[PDB]
Symmetry: D3
Subunit: 153 residues, 6 copies
């Protein structure tokens, strides 16, 4: 009824449960849940959620295929072992669980645009972590996250 | 995965399930499923879906309340025992289950703005009925549907 | 969360779902949902809910058994094609789906003890029908409902 | 646990749920549940279940496609408005919802091979109806049911 | 059917799943599942289940609010990082995951009453752990667990 | 629809979810999920799935009884803390989570037969792990896995 969803999240999965459960089920079925989770010695986690259903559908198609490794690498490109809560923080030697270094083309107050795919990233308006949870969620509005390229140090 | 949602529909409930399952459960729990279904005698069914969760949540609050009569009336005003696929057919003595006559203020080829609540209705971009099934679903972007007023004939 | 259960009811099944969903599934699986529903011709429906899980479990054992005819008979004896809201109306030629006439031993303003099984019935504290819907639900605290005996007229 | 599946059935859908819940959901989503149910006027219902997932998957692909009319036709050819419990009753002017007359090539006491698709039908080892309920379920091991051909009378 | 629930639990969540699933879902959604779980270097776990639905509902209201931290502290006050299986064991420097030390007012053979909230605690009759699982579950029948006060050493 | 199941599994639970969910739920409810999971310092995991529903049903009966320890030991006898992908690998000092050493009676290209229960084991045709996942799943077609006997070193 009136209390559908959570408004503050201690984990990114609770947020993803409320937006694309199927995507979360595939993240779990491919043993990638650990990648979403904040662990000590890891900087924190930032997740890139594809707004466009065509991109998410393609991950699903591949995840249920005879070669799901294509879904693993797309998924690895959407998860950053860094805490990147704002556009200002989206700089330096950072990248996804593919080792690829992300390069910012244009940076705006509430938007980041990336080289190598022209991904348009905006912070997810309804993802609010707890204080001292180092979690972030961005919506990818268009383009694609980089799959290949030179890595970060 | 990729095949999640039906593209064509023989009942509105199957559409509703893909958009607001909670709203569909409440409709069923209030013995109002029959109001969404094409009987022989009944011309057809048009359902108005409130886009702003504010309105859908308020229906859910009232449905699980000690007096659910207000949820029933709101739902009655969102179900039309007439087949109104486009704005051109939105004219004459047509109304909801409440019986209040609908009075259109402006039409706009794909948009309809009604008097008595200033409801703004746009056909649903993902609802196509089976042929020979007189079912329509509109999205109410803003405003509200008429609750009381002169009856239609 | 806070809004979990409906406070008012237009069908007994919605009440049953909040108390014993398994029992409701078995009722449906045995094509006995219709027996809980107010038809035009039928006076009303009163359902007797067995409080002791012992009796509900025994119905479930028998329902999934190779001969479910005994589950059907027990369920028949717990559904009454009459609207009996309080002990005062618990009199005359009234009975269950089996057809055995119910004979009250003691009434007690909010309690009814029947002959032929020593069933102890108390109205359900959380079942209120919509007005003009002739639906009642009693809790059988002990005893059992009549299985066989002289029919009512 | 141990009591999971019903051993006797008053409706085919309860059997289908224990074997292919997805197929049952699609049947319901296509307003074809009524075709599996014994009406007064209708003689009885026999349902043909495709054993090879290849055929059931192809129905699901077509059901969620932009033209589900082909799923409807396949399902029509698997539902028989006649009560055909054994091979001996598989004769005369009997057919599916499509209306094509079924022509048996070989019978074999517990096996039936039809013309016009070479369907191989064997009664389902776990479907027993309630007595006085004219319901049958066969397993199609190979082949396909007739889609088009001369009608039965 | 007849085997509804587990009778012996290796974790407290299996017990809570059978009594208040929603409460368990909120415990998981707030990353408090670890607190219920026995870990080496932790004494063991004791969980206080509020019998009264009004208390549990308030946790839910707060958990789905803009400030769920109120639900976290109520939940922390219901979980004890100690193994406290009987009234005799409910003594000494013990308390919840708020640091607050619990003080016993009256101790009975099957009941404990606490200062600072007048909580009435009785061992949950259907919670039986495995041998050498250091798990306990009490029902809080009335009053409240302490939220604030001097801590244990 | 067409993408029912996963074709490649990073965990054995995803496979078991697609064949006996209830068995998986009981494995989780008895805190035996960890045994299915590959951990560093553990060789790998091999799971023996009983083809025969009578064996799996007996585990369920016992798991929901007052003494579920009988289900724990049967379950321990079905899980091997070794990676055993083929018949050639099924030799040496290996066994289940009971310490009992498995002895091969007859070994075939696609089948292994065991002493002390005459278990007939065949690799599960639809279990394909990822490269460098050390996971295997066999179907036990008849007989039983050893419960008692001399242990492996």
């Amino acid at each position: 009824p009136w209390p559908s969803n959570m408004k503050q999240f201690c984990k990114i999965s609770v947020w993803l449960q409320q937006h694309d459960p199927d995507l979360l089920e595939i993240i779990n079925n491919l043993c990638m849940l650990g990648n979403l989770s904040a662990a000590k010695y890891k900087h924190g986690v930032t997740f890139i959620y594809p707004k466009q259903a065509k991109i998410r559908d393609e991950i699903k198609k591949h995840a249920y295929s005879n070669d799901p490794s294509q879904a693993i690498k797309t998924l690895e490109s959407l998860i950053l072992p860094f805490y990147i809560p704002t556009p200002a923080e989206f700089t330096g030697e950072i990248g996804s669980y593919t080792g690829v270094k992300l390069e910012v083309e244009k940076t705006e107050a509430n938007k980041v645009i990336l080289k190598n795919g022209e991904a348009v990233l905006v912070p997810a308006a309804d993802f609010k972590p707890f204080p001292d949870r180092r979690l972030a969620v961005w919506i990818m509005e268009s383009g694609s996250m980089p799959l290949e390229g030179p890595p970060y140090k």
